[PDB]
Design an enzyme around this catalytic site. Structure first.
Site, PDB file in Angstrom:
ATOM      1  N   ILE A 161       0.828  -1.092   0.161  1.00  0.00           N
ATOM      2  CA  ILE A 161       0.126  -0.012   0.169  1.00  0.00           C
ATOM      3  C   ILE A 161       0.751   1.352   0.022  1.00  0.00           C
ATOM      4  CG2 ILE A 161      -1.834   1.293   1.058  1.00  0.00           C
ATOM      5  CD1 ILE A 161      -2.316  -1.500   2.892  1.00  0.00           C
ATOM      6  N   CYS A 162       0.442   2.236  -0.775  1.00  0.00           N
ATOM      7  CA  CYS A 162       1.029   3.452  -0.965  1.00  0.00           C
ATOM      8  C   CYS A 162       0.316   4.363  -0.292  1.00  0.00           C
ATOM      9  CB  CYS A 162       1.436   3.773  -2.497  1.00  0.00           C
ATOM     10  SG  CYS A 162       2.518   5.120  -2.495  1.00  0.00           S
ATOM     11  N   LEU A 163       0.682   4.839   0.873  1.00  0.00           N
ATOM     12  CA  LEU A 163       0.014   5.842   1.741  1.00  0.00           C
ATOM     13  C   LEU A 163       0.884   6.322   2.676  1.00  0.00           C
ATOM     14  CD1 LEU A 163      -3.016   6.545   2.869  1.00  0.00           C
ATOM     15  CD2 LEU A 163      -2.608   4.726   4.264  1.00  0.00           C
TER      16      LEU A 163
END
Lengths: 149, 140
Positions: A85-87
């Site tokens: 996840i890119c967050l």
């Protein structure tokens, strides 16, 4: 001899006061490891689906961010082929003041409002940017294929 | 004693595989880049100099089961090799014959397994074994 108060606290509050649309249960062997299920957010192409996620609280938590990954295949510009996840808050913007609860709803919020423009988005981002309508139909297709059982 | 769960350990190994280690004479990566279970890996060993394995690239398959890394991975050569501890008909690595596997510890990794196999290629009992022709592979 066991876990820091904070972890005990966050664990027990996860099971006492569950986040709406999110189940989060402890692993049977590892007290820092959790099995999470996020419902697809209302009015998103994931609505109706359920998505498995895994969460680990590292030794250095809460100095260190929790580790989180999807374990259900999902079509989304900020979740890669391996569920990573890119967050912001999972890396650069992590600070100890953030609870597991905050990360989890933020992930839900990401499903509700994808960011295809993110510097770290995968090849799926290109579809979302240029043919958003098709990309949203494809996210719905993958919800049917992978997130309904 | 905080244990990192299997999936998170394998993610660490994935990133380390991409970055590479040492002189690059061993390398590893996911066999299937859409495999969310992170189970099946490709291993690579460059045969060490001044042995009969020299200037050959060996490809391996490495299987990280449900209990990895508490339990050792399964390993087999795809590239044909004559080496003690490797079944010369199927390429399967006999865990009992390779110390890193027979004496597995949960601090070990795919990298460690590959470096050990490369070190063992330099052993007196292996380095002089006549090899099959370059480029041959086992079935299955």
């Amino acid at each position: 001899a066991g876990l820091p108060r904070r972890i005990i606290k966050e664990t027990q509050r996860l099971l006492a006061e569950p986040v709406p649309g999110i189940k989060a249960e402890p692993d049977e062997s590892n007290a820092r490891y959790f099995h999470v299920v996020i419902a697809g957010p209302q009015d998103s192409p994931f609505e109706g689906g359920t998505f498995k996620l895994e969460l680990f609280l590292p030794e250095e938590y809460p100095m260190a961010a929790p580790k989180v990954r999807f374990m259900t295949k999902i079509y989304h510009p900020n979740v890669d082929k391996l569920g990573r996840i890119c967050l912001d808050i999972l890396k650069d913007k992590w600070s100890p003041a953030l609870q597991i609860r905050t990360v989890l709803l933020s992930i839900q919020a990401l499903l509700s409002a994808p960011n295809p423009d993110d510097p770290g988005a995968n090849d799926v981002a290109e579809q979302w940017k240029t043919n958003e309508a098709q990309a949203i139909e494809t996210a719905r297709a993958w919800t049917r294929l992978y997130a309904m059982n | 004693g905080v244990k990192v769960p299997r999936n998170f350990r394998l993610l660490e190994e994935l990133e380390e595989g991409q970055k590479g280690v040492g002189d690059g004479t061993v390398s590893w990566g996911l066999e299937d880049d859409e495999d969310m279970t992170l189970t099946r890996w490709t291993g690579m060993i460059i045969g060490p100099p001044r042995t009969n394995y020299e200037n050959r690239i060996y490809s391996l398959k490495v299987e990280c089961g449900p209990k990895y890394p508490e339990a050792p991975p399964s390993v087999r050569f795809v590239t044909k090799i004559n080496m003690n501890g490797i079944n010369n008909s199927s390429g399967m690595v006999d865990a009992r014959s390779i110390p890193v596997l027979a004496k597995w510890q949960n601090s070990y990794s795919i990298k460690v397994v590959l470096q050990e196999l490369r070190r063992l290629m330099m052993s007196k009992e292996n380095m002089k074994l006549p090899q099959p022709p370059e480029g041959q592979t086992y079935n299955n």
